[PDB]
Ligand binder design. Structure first.
Ligand SMILES: [Co+2]
Ligand SMILES: [Co+2]
Ligand SMILES: [Co+2]
Ligand SMILES: [Co+2]
Lengths: 329, 329
C-alpha cells in the first residue's frame, strides 16, 4: 500500500522514477553535527544537496533511496529538509554498515533486531521519521558480527515487509554467502537487493542470483578512477573500469531475460567524510552530473545500444515500486 | 582564570569539591539519540543521572568533569539538562577515546587539532557549549592514529591553556609514552593528568611521572570484581583489586611527597553501552554509592588512616582548581 519517506508515508504510485542506492551525506554517526565545517557548513551541504536533487529531478527522478545507516552518519532531519526544498521523495534506511561502533558491535541478534524494528515501526531518533529500507554490508566473508546483522535484517524484514539492500565486494561473490544466510532465516529473495554488483565481470554470478529471485544492484555506474589512477583513495573506491563497462552489465542482464530483477543507481553523495578529506571534490570532477548521471547518461547510452524505452522505464519505475512496496513475497 | 562548564564559565572558587573523571553516559556517538530504549529511555536515564548528582552533591560534590568524548557518546545537551536539574557543575570534554569512527580515523593531526579547538573555542555541536578539558586514550603502545590524537591534544592545549587528561592501561605503563609524546610537543606536564593510574600498584611508575610534574589520576577507586569473579565483562572492566587497595595508592603518593599531583574520582556513569547489556546494573550492585563513593567512603577511609582534613581538602578542591583553570604552565 504505502512507503515510509522522510516527509511521511506516500502511495507507491507517487514514487515514480526512483534511484535505489544513493546518499545525501556519507559520514559517521554524529559527525555532521559535531563537525559541520568539514563539509563547508551544514547550510552549504544542504544547499549543495538541494541543487543536486533539483537537477536529478529536472532529469526525471522523483524519488531516491538514501541507504545511509546509523553508522554511515545518516542525519534524517537533513534528509527531510532537502527533500522538502527539492521536492524529491527520500526513503531513509536502517541497518548497519561496515563501521559499527562498540555500542553496536556488542549487541546480540535479538537486540539488533529490536533496533532495526525501532527505526522502521517507531521512527529514527526522536524524529518520527520511519525507515523504508534496511541496509546491510559485508566485505568478503562475513565477520561474526556481520552474520548477526544479516540475520537481524532478515528478521526485521520478515516482521514488516520492508526490503533489505546490501553492500558487497562483488569480486569475492559476497552475494552468495549473504543469500545463503538470508534464506536460512526464511527470507524471500524478492525482498533482497544484492548491491555493488556492477563491480564484477562475472555474469554467471549475477544471473544465478537473479534466477533465484534476488534483485541485482547495478548501483555504482559512474564510478571510475581512470585518469586519476594514482589517487589511492579514489582508486580503491571507484576501481579501474569505465562507466560504460558498468552500464553494459545492465544490458547483459536484460539480454539474459532478467530485466525484472535489475535496480540501477549512482551511489552518489553530496558530502563524504569517509576517505581522503577532499574525496567529494575528486568524485565531482569524475562525474559532474551527480545523481542525474543515471537519467542523463546511462539511459540514453542504453537506448543507443538498442534497449527498448519500455524496458528502461520498467527498470527505473516498476522494479523499485515492486521492491519497496511492503510484502513478505 | 575561569573554567567552562555546560552552563557557562564559573570562577575557581565556584568549582569547589570536584570529581575529575566521571561520565553521565558511556556510549558511542549518536547511540543515545538513535536507541534511547537501550537505557530504558532518555527520560529514565536523565532521571537516574539527576538523582545520582543530587546524591553526590549531598555528599559534598559541587563539580564533575564529564570526560566523555565524541566517540564515547558525549551528549552535551543531556549534560546541560542534568547539570541544571541537579545544580552540579559539569565540565564537558573534547578529544577522542578508543573507539573513533572512520570519519575520525582518516583525519590528519592538523584536522584533529582544528576539531578539538572548535569544541573548546567555538562550542560543541550547535550548542555553543565549550569543552573545558581534552581527553585522550591509549591501550598499550599508541597506534599510528593515537599518536596523531595525542599530538593534536598537546597543540590544542598549547593554544588554549585547557588541560589534557588520559585513559591508560596502567599495566602497560602507557603514561611513559604519553608523556614522551606530550613533551615532544612541548606541552607542560602541569597541564596533563595520566588517568587510570590506580589500576596498578607500581609506585615507581607513578612517582616517575609525578616527579616530572604530571598529575596522577587515581580515578576508578570503586572498581573491583571481587565476588563476581565469573562475570566476563565486570572482571575485564574492574579488575580484581579491592577499592581499599586502589585508595591506599592515594596515601602512598601523599607519603612520598606528591599530594599536589593527585586527582581522585570514581569513573562512575549512569548509562553504559560499551560492555554486556546490563553492565550498569552489575556496577551499581558493586557500588550503590555511585559518585558519592569518593566523598562517603574513600575520604573517611583516608581520614581513619591519619590523612589530615587539610590534605584531603587540597586533593579534592585545590588540585582540581589548579588543574582546570586555563594556563600553559
Ligand atoms: Co556500499
Ligand atoms: Co552506498
Ligand atoms: Co577510560
Ligand atoms: Co572514564
Amino acid at each position: 500500500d504505502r512507503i515510509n519517506t522522510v516527509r511521511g508515508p506516500i502511495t507507491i504510485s507517487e514514487a515514480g522514477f526512483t534511484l535505489t542506492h544513493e546518499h545525501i551525506c556519507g559520514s559517521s554517526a554524529g559527525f555532521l553535527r559535531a563537525w559541520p565545517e568539514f563539509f563547508g557548513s551544514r547550510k552549504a551541504l544542504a544547499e549543495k544537496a538541494v541543487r543536486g536533487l533539483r537537477r536529478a529531478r529536472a532529469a526525471g527522478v522523483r524519488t531516491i533511496v538514501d541507504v545511509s545507516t546509523f553508522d554511515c552518519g545518516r542525519d534524517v532531519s537533513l534528509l527531510a529538509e532537502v527533500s522538502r526544498a527539492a521536492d524529491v521523495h527520500i526513503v531513509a534506511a536502517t541497518g548497519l554498515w561496515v563501521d559499527p561502533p562498540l555500542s553496536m558491535r556488542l549487541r546480540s541478534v535479538e537486540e539488533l533486531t529490536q533496533f532495526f524494528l525501532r527505526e522502521i515501526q517507531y521512527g529514527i531518533e526522536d524524529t518520527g521519521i520511519r525507515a523504508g529500507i534496511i541496509k546491510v554490508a559485508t566485505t568478503g566473508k562475513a565477520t561474526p558480527f556481520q552474520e548477526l546483522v544479516l540475520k537481524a535484517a532478515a528478521r526485521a524484514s520478515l516482521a514488516t515487509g520492508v526490503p533489505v539492500t546490501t553492500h558487497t565486494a562483488a569480486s569475492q561473490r559476497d552475494g552468495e554467502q549473504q543469500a545463503a544466510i538470508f534464506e536460512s532465516e526464511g527470507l524471500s529473495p524478492s525482498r533482497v537487493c544484492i548491491g555493488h554488483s556492477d563491480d564484477t565481470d562475472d555474469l554467471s554470478y549475477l544471473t544465478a542470483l537473479a534466477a533465484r529471485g534476488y534483485l541485482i544492484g547495478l548501483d555504482q555506474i559512474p564510478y571510475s578512477a581512470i585518469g586519476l589512477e594514482d589517487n589511492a583513495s579514489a582508486s580503491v573506491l571507484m576501481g579501474n573500469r569505465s562507466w560504460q563497462t558498468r552500464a553494459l552489465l545492465i544490458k547483459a542482464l536484460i539480454d539474459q531475460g532478467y530485466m525484472k530483477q535489475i535496480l540501477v543507481s549512482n551511489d552518489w553523495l553530496f558530502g563524504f567524510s569517509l576517505y581522503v578529506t577532499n574525496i567529494m571534490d575528486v568524485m565531482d570532477r569524475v562525474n559532474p552530473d551527480g545523481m542525474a548521471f543515471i537519467p542523463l547518461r546511462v539511459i540514453p547510452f542504453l537506448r543507443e545500444k538498442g534497449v527498448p524505452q519500455e524496458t528502461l522505464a520498467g527498470i527505473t519505475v516498476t522494479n523499485p515500486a515492486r521492491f519497496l512496496s511492503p510484502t513478505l513475497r
